[PDB]
Amino acid sequence: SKVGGNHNYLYRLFRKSNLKPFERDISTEIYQAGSTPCNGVKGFNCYFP
Amino acid sequence: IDGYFKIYSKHTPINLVRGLPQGFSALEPLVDLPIGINITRFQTLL
């Protein structure tokens, strides 16, 4: 813990489906949580995963 | 299977021109790879 807030520990917030045991994913592509498909870098229902 | 990549190898002395061998042969496990990658497709080298 750091007094200014340790932001080095990152973790995913959105994912398409349940993963498998002992499996790791590295791709940080923007998740298309909305009904319509999303592209670009940002947008509504297009959050940083 | 669950991130374990298994190599099965066998050297078989054959005398054939175009036909697949007519016989039986066991296949030992050579080396198991614990790398644990995500795989979809494959290509060979010529």
Contact residues on chain B for A21, CB-CB shorter than 8 A: 2
Method: cryo-EM
Q: Are the Cβ atoms of A21 and B38 closer than 8 angstroms?
A: no
Give resolution, Å, one decimal.
3.8
Buried b (16+ CB within 10 A) or exposed e, A7-42: eeeeeeeeeeeeeeeeeeeeeeebbbeeeeebeeee
- Helix, strand, coil percentages for chain A (3-state, nearest 5): 0, 10, 90
- B30: phi > 0 → left, psi -120 to 50 → alpha, else beta; which? alpha
B15 touching chain A per CB within 8 A:
no
Q: Are the Cβ atoms of A22 and B2 closer than 8 angstroms?
A: yes
